[model samples]
Target chain A: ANRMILNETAWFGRGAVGALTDEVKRRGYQKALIVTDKTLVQCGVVAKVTDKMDAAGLAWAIYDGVVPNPTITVVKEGLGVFQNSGADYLIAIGGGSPQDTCKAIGIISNNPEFADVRSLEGLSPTNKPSVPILAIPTTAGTAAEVTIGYVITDEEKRRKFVCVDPHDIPQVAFIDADMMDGMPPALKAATGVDALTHAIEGYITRGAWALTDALHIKAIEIIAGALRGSVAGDKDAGEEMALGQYVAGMGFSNVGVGLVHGMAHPLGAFYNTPHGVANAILLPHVMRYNADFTGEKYRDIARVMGVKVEGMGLEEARNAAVEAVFALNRDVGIPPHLRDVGVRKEDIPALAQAALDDVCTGGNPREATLEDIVELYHTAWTS
Target chain B: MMANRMILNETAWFGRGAVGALTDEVKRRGYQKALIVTDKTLVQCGVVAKVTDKMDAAGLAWAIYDGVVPNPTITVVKEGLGVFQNSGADYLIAIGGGSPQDTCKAIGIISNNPEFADVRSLEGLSPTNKPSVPILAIPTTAGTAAEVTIGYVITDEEKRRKFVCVDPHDIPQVAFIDADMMDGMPPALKAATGVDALTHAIEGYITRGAWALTDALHIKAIEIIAGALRGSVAGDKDAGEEMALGQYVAGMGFSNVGVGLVHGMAHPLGAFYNTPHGVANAILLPHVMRYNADFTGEKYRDIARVMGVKVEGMGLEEARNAAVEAVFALNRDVGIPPHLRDVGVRKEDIPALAQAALDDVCTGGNPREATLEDIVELYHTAWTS
Candidate 1:
């Protein structure tokens, strides 16, 4: 049997966040605990959301302490704010960091037995659903608003652990391109490539089936068609990317991703690397490594990437798929090698070991040994 | 400023034994008793028993109200409502095709909001404030997709027309798209309902409200339906599973984006002759596709591509023609009648049918702005061709 779970309601397009006030009123939520980062506040993105809430006489308190690579401590701090504010619900208003932090706070707040945060790792045993969350993403990547999993770095242990629980899915998501319009060109490149990696890995994962295939293939088509133009700051392309990333999340959240995500988590742990950049740099190399194991899926990928792979041999088509992603990364100005992103030659063994133990590695289409992961890291480090 | 909103079943299960999820969900939600809404044929054929046996084994109580007929009328809704009110059921379990499901919606809606007891008052975007008595929908056919959609059609026997009611509050709390529930359908019913799913995919794809998200769903649905419908009608169990998902996918699109002239034309046939809803749609779908082709802008090319037509180098007009031809060929293979007259439609009713088609809620979403004269002419052609 296959089970599908989704947010019951979602609104998409420009100015989609305007629905927030009405939804809050309709659901009878009295006050919101707004979880976000200080950068969005300084840049006036949070004001756009707050302006409407203010007009509608909705009460809210801000906890703008979220940072990239959100840690366990960040979640606890947000939980303190949520508890102290007596807010009835949460509104998350940034990219992955704020969304991830907000989910952790909501989950731990309702199920206080998991207050230690470490106990919530890897398919939590919590019995209750989290406090209601209304997510508005400020970046086109992560799509944490719609996904059922969140990643939090354990700063004391120098590792990032994933927590997968259906109870943590946000109650509603407002995917407004205007919220993402303020992204810097580099951030757009990194996040856009991260979305592509999600599409690719989810399409070939062991758990993938027909329903998720429809979502992932369409996501691949949209991300490939829009990412470069979006990075170049086209408004329409930015809107398409907003929908594409969410669609990718709709698939990958149901059926998890492969080794690219597993391998990228370790880099974030070791170097505090930006998650999108880590995924972007590892994507092409891992696609090549997993190509032989993916069967005819690469032909679909190559075709959607605008390569004429219909008459080509399977090996040639698979090579074209890898080349298309590599070209996209180069076009978006991503660093080509892990060495450029601060990876050390001597750390390959540890990184490989950490990646092998990561939860997402089990879903990879190609099974990797410690030696294989070490070899992949060495190739990506210097290539 | 163009925004898209989607309301889906927050939880759904699919595959052979998916109905097994029902008892657990019912127990979890604390629903005490169920009013099982279905048709007598299903009950006699053991499909209804399949679900009730599970409930009985799990110590759940349910009352059966199997009074639904195809193209169910307001009287059917009223009678079903009577059963529900007297049964003391806390929730409803709808188990059949569109008729039973639509009747169940009306019964549930009226039971909660007594102001709409007349049924006609709830037509065309009714302003009911409260949600229907909570429903757990299990579909026994691979078509209609009433389990997930928010719209229901009820016939006004006095006025001789069918009215569509769209209310977000009427959406089922959960849906089970189990092929096991569909294994009892005869081949003709399978063919009709499978084509109904195709019409939804085609019409929803070309509708004026079509957008990126719904377009993705419609195209994938078209691909799946085109591949699986023939095998499903031939009694292939795997194909039946594919059809179940395909129709639900189409419902997810058309229920939100709305469908076009095929639905507008089909509703009147159901009201007038009690024509099977799917047969009317299957006959009119190709004709409406030809009429709306000019306004669709490359969507027909997409339709042709997914329907297995070799449209790689075809020109715009040629690709559009191929799409219509594809639908026509599929209908022929499925043994649908070629003309409306074959299905007991009198030529004299064309004008009234055209007027009804013009006033239908679905006609507003058509890519082409249809006139009453245009509808009349389309009906005349469908009747004789």
Candidate 2:
């Protein structure tokens, strides 16, 4: 049986965040712990939300300690703030880091038995649902607002562990393009490719069924149609990108992603590479590796990517799909090699080992041995 | 800002034998007793037994309320509510198709918000103060998608009208779109309900509230329904499974974005003649699509394309015609009556039906702005053509 789980409520559009006030009021939440990063605070993105909350007389306190590749330590600190602040719910107001941190905080708060951050890793059996979270995305990537999984770095252990729990899904998500409009061009390109990677990986993943395939292919179409224009700072494309990523999350969160994500997690742990950049760099290489196993699915991918594959054979269409991603990454200014993203040759073995051991690897369409992963890492490093 | 809001069942399961999850969910939520709202037809046919058997095996307490009739009315809701209150059921497990599911929602909604006991007071976005008693909805037909949708239609026999009630609070907590539950449908029922799903996808795709997210769902639903409906009517099990998911996907869109004049027109037929909801929708869908064609921009091309018409290079008008023709062809293939007259809609009743259609809650979402005269003319055209 195929099961689908989604946020019970979601609002989307340019000014979709405006609904937050009414949603908060309707739910009768007494106070909110606004989980986010300092950059959003300084740039006034948080103000866009808080200003509305303030005008509506909704109570909230800010916890802006979230950093990129948010650590286990950060989640605990956020939890401390949530506990001390008397907050009844969480308002996650940034990209994946803050959203992931907020989910960790909320889950641990409601299910205190799993408070040791590491215990929640890899589909940990947590009985109770998380304290309510209203997630607002500030970047049109990761789609953490809607996804059921989160990544937390174990700084001491030098690893990023994925936590998959149905309870971690936000109660509501607002995919407001206005919140994402202020993103720098580079961040847009990186995050946009990250969303594409999600769509691609989810489409070809082992667990993908017809329902998820429909969502992922549609997401691929939207992301391919909009990502370049969005990176060029087009408002319309940015809005499309915001919707596209959430759609991808809707699919991938239900049926996990594949090798690209499994490999990307280690990059974040090793070098503090942005999650999107790591995925963007590894996506094309992994797509090529898995192409043979994906069947006619790649032809659909190629067609949605705007490649005219009507007259092509299956092998040619699969190659076209891989080339389409290569072109998209190049067009979006993603580096062509892991070396450019700061991967060392000596780290390849460890990265390969970690990737093979990662939770997401099990969902890959093609089984990767440790040697295959080592080769993938080495090839991605030099090429 | 063109904001779109979606409220979906937070959890749902699909495929055969998915009803087995019901017991676990009931126990997990600690619901003591279930009021199985359904119809006598389903009960007699043993479809309702399929669900109850699982519940009985799990030793779950339940009481059946099978008073719901096709085109269920306020009286039906009142009767179901009485059963629910007296049975000491904490939650509802709705079985069968749209009629039973709509009756279940009304019963559950009124049980929580007793002030709307009059039933008519709950029409057109009622000020419901509380969430309904929790509900687990299962569908026996691939049409209606009432299991996932928040809106329910109740025929007001006294008034000779069907009032559409939309309440977010009434959304089922969980839904099981199991083909095993839908396998008993005869060929005619399958065809009519399948066309009903097609109508929802088309109407929701072109509705004024349609946006990027809902469009994605509607288009995918349209494609799936178009591909599987014929095979489903032929009693193909795999095709039946596809129909189950297709209709639910359509609900995920229209429940949030709303459907258009096809639904608006279909509701009045159910009220006026006690016509089957799906049959009424099947007969009226192509006519309404033709009427609303000019207002929809290139959307019909999408409809035509997904329905397997080669519209790649077709001009706007041709593509729109192809879309309408495609629906007409599907209805024909499924043995749907070609005109309203064939379905027992009277020429004399056209004006009254038009007025009722204009007043329908769904009419407001139609891309075309239809006047009373236009609706009357549309009904007259459907009556004889």
Candidate 3:
């Protein structure tokens, strides 16, 4: 037997957020704390949402203090503001960082026992549902608007941690491409690749089932068909990217992802690296290394990625799939090696050990020993 | 902006022995006593006993309200509600086909929103503010899919009309889709209900409001039903399981997107002749498919492909014809009469039936609009043919 849970309600398409006015009234929430970042606030992206709330006569406050790879301190301080502001709900309106920070604040606000923030690491048995959030994302990746997991950086501990709790899922979402169209080229490329990593890792993860496989392969197909044009500001393809990343989360958040995320989380902790960029740089190499354990699934990847494999052998299809992802990685301008992104040779071993300790590693298709993880890190450092 | 809303059970279980999770769900939700809504036929056949035994062993309190009949009535719901209040039951465990499940939804909805206690007020998306009393539904037939759908049919004996209530507020909180519950179904019920599920899949797939998410579910359901419905009707265990899940997937689509004229036409038959809803659907589906063919936008080719017609080299018209033929053959093989007249649909009542069908809530979602004259002609054609 198998089971699943998802946002029982979501809206998709351009201008999907237009439904927010009616939804707010229908849900009967009295006030909202709009969680966002300074970049979005400055660029007038935040205005897009405030206009809707104003028109709806919905009361609100704004917290634009979110940082990239949100730190635990941000979550702690945000919780204080959320509690004091008397906001009854949350409207998360930026990319993953603000989305994650909103989830932390919402979770801690409902179950204050986890108020320390660090107590939420690695599948804490949170008994209560987070304060209801109406998540609307301004970027096409991470899919934090839909996923059941969040990443928070513990600056004092000098490590990033993941918290997996279904109770923290957004109660509703608006996956509007108009919200995503503001992403600059670099953000588009990075987040698009992060979405691809989610699709591939979820498809090959140990816990994948038939239901999740159908969703993941469709996510891969949509991402592969649209991500390049989306990065180039193709309006229609940008719409596809918005829905594609959310669909990737529909599968991955229910099952799990593998070592790409396991290794990528630490990069954010140690260097404050952009989460998507780290995932993008590691995805292709990790996919290639994991290929031996993936059984004919690579053929599906190749076919969905638009590689011609009609007359090719399985091995050839696998290589074509990896090469196609690698080609896209370079086209998106992700650095080709870890060293190019500023990983030191001396830190490789330490990063490898940290990756081994990641909760995501358990779901990797291949069981990686400590020695194997170190070797893989060595190869990625200079690839 | 294209607005879409999908409401599903927050929790559901599917597989061979998923009913084992039911007692656990009852305990977890702290439902002190369950009012099991079912029928005397199932109770006599030992199906209700099987579930009650499990509940008894788990030490859960319960009361039996086996008053539901085919084409459940407002009277039945009111009676069940009385039993429920007297029993002090906090939740409902509905066990049967569409009849029992529909009756359960009515009782639950009326219990919470007594202002609509007359039941007719619940029709056509009534503005009920609160949710139905929590329903944990289990289906004993692979049709109606009332366990998942937010709509239910309740007949008014005095008015001779069946009303479909479309309220998201009445959606079941949990569904235990256990195929084992369907193992004892007779062949005719199995075949008729299986065809009804296929109609839901095909109709929902081509409905005017259908979108990508519902398309995925409807298309997958068509594929599963085509492959398994025949074997399931023949009493194959694994095929029964496939059909069980197939029907639920179809409901997940049609419940959100709405169904076409097949359902619109089928509802009046149930009210007029006290016909089984699935039998009415099985008889009307192919005829409506032909009527709605032109507006379908190459979707029939997909229907043809999933229904096991090898349409790779066929032109659009050929593929469309093949899909209609495939459905006809399945209906014939399942022992469905080709015409409504065989099911006691009399010629003198054709005009009234056609008028009622044109006025049905489901008719609005049909890709092809039907004039009253058009519906009369179609009903006459079916009667004569």
Best by TM-score: 2
Task: Write candidate 3's Cα lDDT for A1-383 as tens digits.
Answer: 66655676678888888988878887789999999899998998889889988987899998989999999888987888899999999999999999999999999998989989999999877877899999999888888988889999999887888998877888788888888888989999999989989999999999897667877898899999999899888999998898789889888987899999988987888888888888887887788889999998999999999998899888888899989998998887778788887778787777788889998888899987877877777777774
lDDT by residue (tens digit), candidate 1, A1-383: 67777777888999899889988987789999999999999999999999999999999999999989899999999999999999999999999999999999999999999998999989997777789999999998898988889999999998999999877889889999999999999998888888888889999999998999989999999999999999999999999999999999988988889889999998998898988899988888899999999999999999999899978999999999999998998899989899999999898899899899998888899998999899888888875
lDDT accuracy of residue A135 in candidate 2: 97
Clashing pairs in 3: none
Candidate 1 ranges beyond 4 A from true positions: B27-30, B85-88, B111-114
Q: What's the lDDT for all of these models?
A: 0.92, 0.92, 0.88
At residue B137, candidate 3 shows an lDDT of 92
Give the Cα error of residue B114 in candidate 1, in Å.
4.1
lDDT of 2 by residue, B1-385 (tens): 4688999988899888889888988876778899999988899999989988888899999999999999899999998999999999999999989999999999999999999999999998878878899999999999899998989989899999999899888999999999999989999999999999998999999999988788889999999999999999999989999999999999999999888888888888888899888898888888899999999998999999999999978999999999999999999898888888888888888888999999998999999988899889888878864
- The chain A TM-scores for the candidates, taken one by one, are 0.99, 0.99, 0.98
TM-score of candidate 3 relative to the true fold = 0.95
lDDT of 1: 0.92
Ordered from best to worst DockQ, the candidate numbers read 2, 1, 3
The regions of model 2 sitting more than 4 angstroms off are none
Looking at model 1, the pairs that clash are none
List the lowest-lDDT window of 10 residues for candidate 2 chain A.
Answer: A374-383
What TM-score goes with each of the models? 0.96, 0.98, 0.95
**What lDDT does candidate 1 reach at residue A90?**
98
Write the number of the candidate with greater lDDT, choosing between 1 and 3: 1
Fnat per candidate, as a fraction, reads 0.79, 0.84, 0.62
Please give, for residues B1-385, the per-residue lDDT of candidate 3 as tens digits.
Answer: 4767777666677777878888977875678999999999999999888789999999999999999989999899889999988989999999999999999999999898889878889988878877899999989999778988989999988888888899877888789888889999999999999999999999999999998778888988999999998899888999999998899989988999999888888889999899998888888888899999999999999999999999999999999999999999999887888888788999999899998999999988999988898788878767746
